[PDB]
Amino acid sequence: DVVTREYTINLHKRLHGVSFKKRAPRAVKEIKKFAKLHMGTDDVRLAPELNQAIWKRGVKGVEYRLRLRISRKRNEEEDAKNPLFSYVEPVLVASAKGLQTVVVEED
């Protein structure tokens, strides 16, 4: 079931008490685990525009709230995982506050 939604994600409560050399690499593994919870897939991808959005304030200055877009798609032939995989990508907005989850229509 191809379904694409929006999400904020509170990276302040997930990076609590982590060493400063491992905050930005941990925030990558937190999003791969966040996509597994909502979509229920194992193959999670991150567009390189999302990688720039985490690492922009150095290793130790990861933002509190990101605003993600997660697309669940069909997988290609002769892949032995499962036919579905997520694709996490960013949507830029002025403030990440005050926004709740919204189902994106397709066309």
Q: How far apart are CA 3 and CA 83, in angstroms?
A: 14
Q: How far apart are CA 37 and CA 33, in angstroms?
A: 7
Q: Which two tokens stand for residue 86?
A: 């997520």
**Residue for token pair 């990276």:** 11
Select 22 or 97, whichever has its Cβ closest to RNA: 22
Report 9-38 residues binding RNA (CB under 7 A): 19, 21-22, 24-26, 28-29
Select 2 or 103, whichever has its Cβ closest to RNA: 2
Residues forming contacts to RNA in the complex (CB under 7 A) are: 19, 21-22, 24-26, 28-29, 44-48, 51-52, 55-56, 58-59
